[PDB]
C-alpha cells in the first residue's frame, strides 16, 4: 500500500513525465490531456486533481525542463574549464547553444512556451532561473574586476533577451548548422565587447 | 466612387481601428465584431478584406513596423549622429523613446510573437526595422567601426536585447530609474561592441 500523499506525488510526476515526452515530440497543440493521462497510466479524474487544465500541466512541464536545462548547462560550463567569472559567461553561451539545440528543448522552450505562456508567463516560469544565474555571474564578474560596475538586473535581462533570440534565430533558420556557427561567433564577440 | 477607393478606404479603416483597439487592450481581448464596429464596416465587408483575425493582425503589424522604422529614423537623424557607429549608439536612445509607446509594446513585443509565431513576425520585420538594423551594421563594418562578423545574427540578437530592455522598463516598479539604468547598460554593451 502507498499513502495518499505518495500516490499523489507519483501521479503528479508520471503526468509531468508523460506530457514532457509527448509534447516534446509533437508540440503542445498536437497532444490532448486524454492521451497524456493514458500515457502516464492514470485516470482523467486523478489528472484533473493534480492539474486544473492543459495549461497548468504545461507550466509544470516548462518548470521541470528549465531546471533540467540549467543542470545540463552547469555540466557543460564545468566541462569547459572556465576558471574566471567572465570565462564562465563565455562558456554559458556555448552551453546554451548546445542545450537549446535539443529537439525537445526546441519544441517546448523555444516554440511552444513563449506562445502558450505569453511574455509575462514565459518570464515568470521559464526565464526566472536563467536570469538569476546570469545576475550572479555578472555580479561575480564585476567583483573580479572583469566587468565594469553597472546595474546588474538590467544587464542580465538584456543578455537573456539576446540569448533567447539567438536560440530562436537558430531554431527557425533554413540551415540551422550554419546559423548556430554564425550566431556563436556574434555572441562571443558581444560578450567579449561587454567585458574588459 | 471608384471600386478600389472603396476597398482601400475599408481596408484602411479596419487596420486603423484594429491597431487602436488591440493597442489598448491586446489582441486576445478584442474580437472582429468590435473592430468592424469601430471602423464603421459591415461584417461582410470586413470578411472580404481579411480572411481571419490573424490576417488582419498581419497588416496591423506591417503598418506599426513601418511607423517604428520611421520614428526610429527620425530620432536618430535628430540626434546629430554622423557616423554609422554613432547611428547605432543613437538607436539605443531612439528605441527607448519609441518603445515607451504602449501600443508599440502591445502589438510588436507582446502580441506579434504569439499571434504570428517568432518566424512569422520575422518575415514582417525583415522588411522594416530588422532590415534597417542589418544595413546599419553592414555600414559600421564597412567603415572599420565594427568588427566584421555575421550581420544577420548580430542584428537579430541586438533586437532581442532591445525588446527585453523595453519590457524590463515597462514592468519595473520604478520605470524612470529602470530606463536610465537600462540605457546605461545598453550604451556600455554597444560601446564595447564597437
Numbering used by the authors:
A (entry chain A): 5 to 200
B (entry chain D): 6 to 199
Sentences from the paper on this structure:
Here, we show cytokinins induced the strong expression of the M. tuberculosis gene Rv0077c. We found that Rv0077c expression is repressed by a TetR-like transcriptional repressor, Rv0078. As previously reported, Rv0078 forms dimers resembling other TetR-like proteins. Rv0078 has an N-terminal DNA-binding domain (DBD) and a C-terminal ligand-binding domain (LBD).
To gain an understanding of how Rv0078 represses gene expression, we solved the crystal structure of Rv0078 to 1.85 Å by a single-wavelength anomalous dispersion method. The ligand-binding pocket of Rv0078 is largely hydrophobic. Within this pocket, we observed an elongated density resembling a long aliphatic chain of a fatty acid. Gas chromatography-mass spectrometry (GC-MS) of the compounds extracted from Rv0078 purified from Escherichia coli revealed fatty acids commonly found in this organism, and a palmitate molecule fit well with the electron density. A fatty acid carboxylate formed a hydrogen bond with Rv0078 Glu-70, and the long alkyl chain had numerous hydrophobic interactions within the extended ligand pocket. When we purified Rv0078 under denaturing conditions and refolded the protein to remove the lipid, we observed the same EMSA results as we observed with protein purified under native conditions (data not shown), suggesting this fatty acid is unlikely to be the native Rv0078 ligand; however, these data may suggest that the native ligand is fatty acid-like. Interestingly, we found that Trp100 faces the ligand-binding pocket, which suggests Trp100 interacts with the natural ligand. This hypothesis is supported by our data showing an Rv0078W100R mutant was unable to complement the Rv0078 deletion mutant strain (lane 8).
